[PDB]
Design an enzyme around this catalytic site. Structure first.
Site, PDB file in Angstrom:
ATOM      1  N   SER A  33      71.184  33.324  55.062  1.00 27.45           N
ATOM      2  CA  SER A  33      70.062  32.511  55.516  1.00 27.45           C
ATOM      3  C   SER A  33      70.284  31.721  56.805  1.00 27.45           C
ATOM      4  CB  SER A  33      69.637  31.553  54.404  1.00 27.45           C
ATOM      5  OG  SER A  33      68.873  32.236  53.431  1.00 27.45           O
ATOM      6  N   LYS A  36      67.787  31.854  59.543  1.00 31.26           N
ATOM      7  CA  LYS A  36      66.621  30.972  59.561  1.00 31.26           C
ATOM      8  C   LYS A  36      66.661  29.945  60.693  1.00 31.26           C
ATOM      9  CE  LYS A  36      65.831  31.768  54.674  1.00 31.26           C
ATOM     10  NZ  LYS A  36      65.701  31.202  53.303  1.00 31.26           N
ATOM     11  N   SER A  94      66.167  26.203  51.879  1.00 34.44           N
ATOM     12  CA  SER A  94      66.288  27.569  52.384  1.00 34.44           C
ATOM     13  C   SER A  94      65.135  28.375  51.794  1.00 34.44           C
ATOM     14  CB  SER A  94      67.625  28.209  52.000  1.00 34.44           C
ATOM     15  OG  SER A  94      67.877  29.337  52.832  1.00 34.44           O
ATOM     16  N   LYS A 211      72.705  24.389  58.882  1.00 35.23           N
ATOM     17  CA  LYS A 211      72.098  25.318  57.921  1.00 35.23           C
ATOM     18  C   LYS A 211      73.102  26.165  57.144  1.00 35.23           C
ATOM     19  CE  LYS A 211      68.643  27.637  56.008  1.00 35.23           C
ATOM     20  NZ  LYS A 211      69.480  27.852  54.803  1.00 35.23           N
TER      21      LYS A 211
END
Length: 260
Positions: A33, A36, A94, A211
């Site tokens: 992820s 993202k 997420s 992140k």
């Protein structure tokens, strides 16, 4: 120099660009992820960007998270959600459903399929514009594909670029966020509170981003950033062995970087 579980690692002084740590820094691997980050970056750089613009949660966004067993923001089908709310849903828990919503909204095309394709193109165009050579996107969320990869150095450069945006910075350093969405009756719904998956936000003094990521191919990943004594260290670890390990890996790298 600390040892880490991650098979890929990189960190630099965000202001100067000077490298502080490397471990297979240019080796291509799956991102999970962390992809993202690029999704958020592309959205925030759109000319027709309006953080208050509302997006209706399509049944497809929900069916998608279910079919791919993807992490989600639990967006409710039918609800009207703002782009700002979608950015928090994307970055904190997420939300792959939020990622789908953003790509559908900002990609160019007459069908969701066409817009998704167009948005991923924008992601690759953004990588090219950053002068990257070891990064390719085949998704808006890092879900599946051998054609979706990056490196600790490349992802750190993407993160550094994204951090130039104040909205991005505000979002990734947020520990908790509760979205108040609009239902079909026009009523305001208080969604369950979203918590940032980045444990550093609470465990590492000075942490400001960025992140997390975790998948079958990418294993445990984390793009991190922290500021101490007027110095900002930003970096990435790819394929650590667990969540606690990815956090300690990042902690050690930053501590090392600040002491250099």
């Amino acid at each position: 120099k600390p040892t880490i579980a991650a098979v890929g690692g990189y960190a630099m002084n965000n202001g100067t660009g000077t490298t502080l740590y490397t471990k297979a820094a240019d080796t291509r691997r799956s991102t999970g992820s962390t992809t993202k980050i690029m999704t958020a970056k592309v959205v925030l750089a759109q000319s027709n960007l309006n953080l208050d613009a509302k997006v209706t949660i399509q049944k497809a966004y929900s069916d998608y998270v279910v079919a791919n067993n993807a992490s989600q923001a639990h967006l409710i089908v039918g609800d009207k959600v703002t782009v700002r709310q979608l950015l928090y849903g994307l970055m904190l828990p997420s939300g792959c459903d939020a990622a789908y919503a953003l790509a559908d909204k900002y990609g160019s095309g007459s069908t969701r399929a066409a817009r998704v394709k167009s948005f991923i193109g924008k992601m690759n165009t953004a990588a090219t514009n950053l002068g990257l050579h070891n990064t390719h996107f085949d998704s808006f969320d890092g879900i599946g594909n051998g054609a979706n990869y990056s490196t600790p150095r490349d992802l750190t450069k993407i993160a550094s670029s994204a951090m130039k945006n104040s909205t991005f910075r505000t979002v990734v350093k947020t520990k908790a966020y509760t979205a108040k969405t609009v239902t079909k009756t026009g009523s305001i719904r208080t969604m369950d509170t979203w918590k940032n998956t980045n444990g550093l936000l609470s465990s590492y003094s000075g942490a400001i981003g960025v992140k997390t990521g975790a998948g079958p191919e990418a294993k445990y990943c984390l793009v991190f950033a922290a500021t101490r004594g007027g110095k900002t260290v930003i970096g990435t670890v790819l394929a650590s062995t667990s969540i606690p390990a990815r956090e300690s890996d990042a902690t050690k790298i930053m501590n090392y970087g600040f002491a250099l």
